[PDB]
Design a binder for this molecule. Structure first.
Ligand SMILES: Nc1ncnc2c1ncn2[C@@H]1O[C@H](COP(=O)(O)OP(=O)(O)O)[C@@H](O)[C@H]1O
Ligand SMILES: Nc1ncnc2c1ncn2[C@@H]1O[C@H](COP(=O)(O)OP(=O)(O)O)[C@@H](O)[C@H]1O
Ligand SMILES: CC(C)(COP(=O)(O)O)[C@@H](O)C(=O)NCCC(=O)O
Ligand SMILES: CC(C)(COP(=O)(O)O)[C@@H](O)C(=O)NCCC(=O)O
Ligand SMILES: [Cl-]
Ligand SMILES: [Cl-]
Ligand code: NA
Ligand code: NA
Ligand code: NA
Ligand code: NA
Ligand code: NA
Ligand code: NA
Ligand code: NA
Ligand code: NA
Lengths: 307, 307
C-alpha cells in the first residue's frame, strides 16, 4: 500500500553517505556530546553524513522555490548569499538527545564548502519567565505548549527567514531554572538556522514555526527507554549539574539512589510523559526524518518522508 | 514588522499577469460558473491568470525538490512525464464559490503548453454514507471533519501523489443527498490534481492531505456576506435543484420567500456557520493564497504566503 514515507535500517541508510567527507574529530565530538549520549564517530559517519548530504541537496532545491515566487512577483533576482535562510527543526521528548543531534548537525553543516553560517536556537529561551509561569499557574508545565511565548517565538523565526539583518531570542538558564535577565542571543542572517525544542513541530489555528521549516528531524525512542534515560540522567546529575550550590535542583544532590529514582519517576509521570504523549508524539508524523534510537541510544532505524 | 505573507489589491495583482494568455471564451466560462457566482472574463484575466502563472512557476520548482530527494536516495532520475503529481487544495466555507474557482483553475491549467492532465476531486465523495452518518449521529454535521472517511481520503491522495496508475474516489450525489452506490471517479496519474473541499487544509495528530499539498487556495469572504449568499442561493434553488421530485430538499420548493429564509438561516446557524468558525477559518492561515471576495462575489484582495 503506497506511503508518504520510506523506512531504512542503519545498513541501508549508511550506503547513502556516498562521497560525503567526515570533517569532525573524536575530540570535537566530545564537546558536542550531551550527558548520557553515546554518539561516536562511527554513528556520525553512518547516520549523520547521509543526513547532511540530503540536507545539502535540499538547500539548493529549496532555493528554486523561493526564487520561483520571487520571479512571479517580478522582484529582483535575489542576493547571491543573503539567500532565504534554510530553517531546520529538531523535535523530540526531553532526555532523548535533541541537544546532541542538533549540535552535531550544526557542526557538520558548518564544515561544508564555502563555510555557511549555521546558527542553533533552542526554544527554552522562549519559555515564559518563572514569575509569568507562576502567574499562569504553569510552573509544573515547563515544556508544554502553553508555557512558551509562542508569538515571540514565531516572531523571531519569521524575522530570520524573512531576511532580517539581526534577530534576538531570550536566553534560558538551566542553572537558575529561569530566563536570564538581559541576556539575548543575536542571530544575523544565517544561511541555516536550526530550531531545537520539544514542540517545534506543532501545528495550530495560527501559522507556527513548523510552517516555516524547510526540513525537520524528530529524535525518537520507546517511551520506556526514554524514561530510563531520564531517570538515569537525573541520578547522574547529582554530582554534575545539581552539585552546584546555585542549582534549583541542589537539594536533590543528597538524595540516595532510590530516593532520586522516586523523584525522577514522579517528575516524568506528572510532567514529561504527559507532554510527550499529548503534544510531542502527535507531531512526529509530519517530521521530514525520524531518527529511531534503541535502548542503548543507538540510532538503528530511520523513517524519511518522500512525500 | 516582518511577515510570511504579502497582501495585494486587484490593481497590484493584475500587473503580475504579464504575457499569460487567456484561452477561455465567455461561453466556456458559463459552463464552469456555479449558481450565484458572478465571475466574468475580466476577473479571469486580472485574478486567475496571474495565479495560473505563479502555479506554473511552482510546478517546475516543486519538481526540483522531489528530484533532490530522488537523487539522495540514488533512485533513477525519474520519468519525463509521469512526474510527481502536483497537488492543489481549494478550501473555504460552503456557498463561497470553491466550485467555480476550482473548475476555472482546472480549465486554465488544462489549456497550458503540452496540455497537462488536470483532474479535480471534491471531498464530498469521501463523506460517510447517510446510513453510516446516522449510525454515528452525524446526519446534521455533513461537512464537519468527523463526517468524512479521512483515512480513505488520505489514502486516495497519497496513492495519486505516490505515482499510482489509477486511484478511485467514491461519488456524492447532491440530488440524492448521499453517496452513490457503485459510483467511482478514477484518477490516472495526472500531472495536477485539484482537491476541493471545506476542510482540505486541516492539520492533525496524523499526516493529512493538507500535508501533501504543493499549493493551496482559500476562497474567503466576510461571514455575514457568505450567509447572505447561502440564503439567497437557498431561495433560488426552489426552482432549480429543489424543483426535481427526487430532491431530498424538494419540500422546500413550495416554501415562501420568508419561510425559505427562515429555514436557510437555521441550517446556517446550526450547521455551516459553526463549522466555518470552528474548523474552516482556523485553516486559512496556512493557505498559499487567499482570495478575498467582497459582498458582490468580487475578488478584490489577495494574500499570498511568501514564507
Ligand atoms: N535539571 C537539569 N539541570 C541542568 N541541566 C539540565 C537539566 N535537565 C536538562 N538539562 C540539560 O539541558 C538540556 C535539556 O535537554 P532535554 O531538555 O532533556 O532535551 P534533550 O535531552 O533532547 O537534549 C540538556 O543539555 C540537558 O542535559
Ligand atoms: N442543497 C443543495 N442541493 C443541490 N445542490 C447543492 C445544494 N447545496 C449545494 N449544492 C451544490 O453543490 C456544490 C456545493 O457547494 P458548497 O458545498 O456550497 O461549496 P461552494 O459554494 O464553495 O462551491 C455547488 O455546486 C452547489 O451549488
Ligand atoms: C527547558 C526544557 C523544558 C526544554 O525546553 P526546550 O529547549 O526543548 O523548549 C527542559 O530542558 C527542562 O529543563 N525541563 C524541566 C522539567 C524536566 O526536567 O523535565
Ligand atoms: C457536501 C457539502 C457538505 C460540501 O462538501 P465538500 O465537497 O466541500 O467536502 C455541501 O455541498 C452540502 O451539500 N452540505 C449540506 C448542508 C448544507 O447545505 O449546508
Ligand atoms: Cl488549523
Ligand atoms: Cl500535530
Ligand atoms: Na539522552
Ligand atoms: Na550569528
Ligand atoms: Na518519541
Ligand atoms: Na496538553
Ligand atoms: Na457562491
Ligand atoms: Na483521469
Ligand atoms: Na472564510
Ligand atoms: Na467542530
Amino acid at each position: 500500500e503506497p506511503s508518504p514515507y520510506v523506512e531504512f535500517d542503519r545498513r541501508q541508510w549508511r550506503a547513502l553517505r556516498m562521497s560525503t567527507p567526515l570533517a569532525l574529530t573524536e575530540e570535537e565530538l566530545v564537546g558536542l556530546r550531551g550527558l548520557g549520549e553515546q554518539i561516536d564517530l562511527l554513528e556520525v559517519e553512518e547516520v549523520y553524513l547521509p543526513l547532511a548530504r540530503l540536507i545539502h541537496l535540499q538547500v539548493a532545491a529549496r532555493q528554486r522555490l523561493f526564487a520561483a515566487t520571487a520571479e512571479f512577483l517580478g522582484e529582483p533576482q535575489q542576493n547571491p548569499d543573503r539567500p532565504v535562510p534554510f530553517i531546520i527543526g529538531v523535535a523530540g521528548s526531553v532526555a532523548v538527545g535533541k541537544s546532541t543531534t542538533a549540535r552535531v548537525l550544526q557542526a557538520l553543516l558548518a564544515r561544508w564548502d564555502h563555510h555557511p553560517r549555521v546558527d542553533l536556537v533552542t526554544t527554552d529561551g522562549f519559555l515564559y519567565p518563572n514569575a509569568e509561569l507562576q502567574r499562569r499557574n504553569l510552573m509544573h508545565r515547563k515544556g508544554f505548549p502553553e508555557s512558551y511565548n509562542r508569538r515571540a517565538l514565531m516572531r523571531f523565526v519569521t524575522s530570520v527567514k524573512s531576511g532580517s539583518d539581526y534577530a534576538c531570542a531570550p536566553v534560558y538558564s538551566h542553572l537558575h531554572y529561569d530566563i536570564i535577565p538581559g541576556a539575548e542571543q543575536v542571530v544575523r542572517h544565517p544561511d541555516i538556522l536550526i530550531l531545537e525544542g520539544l514542540n517545534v513541530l506543532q501545528t495550530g489555528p495560527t501559522l507556527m514555526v513548523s510552517d516555516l521549516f524547510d526540513f525537520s528531524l524528530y529524535v525518537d525512542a520507546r517511551i520506556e527507554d526514554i524514561e530510563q534515560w531520564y531517570v538515569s540522567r537525573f541520578l547522574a546529575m547529582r554530582t554534575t549539574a545539581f552539585a552546584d550550590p546555585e542549582s534549583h535542583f541542589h537539594h536533590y544532590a543528597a538524595f540516595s539512589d532510590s530516593q532520586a529514582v522516586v523523584a525522577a519517576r514522579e517528575i516524568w509521570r506528572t510532567i514529561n510523559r504527559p507532554n510527550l504523549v499529548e503534544n510531542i508524539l502527535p507531531t512526529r508524523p509530519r517530521a521530514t526524518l525520524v531518527l529511531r534510537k534503541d535502548a542503548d541510544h543507538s540510532i538503528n532505524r530511520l523513517r524519511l518522508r518522500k512525500l
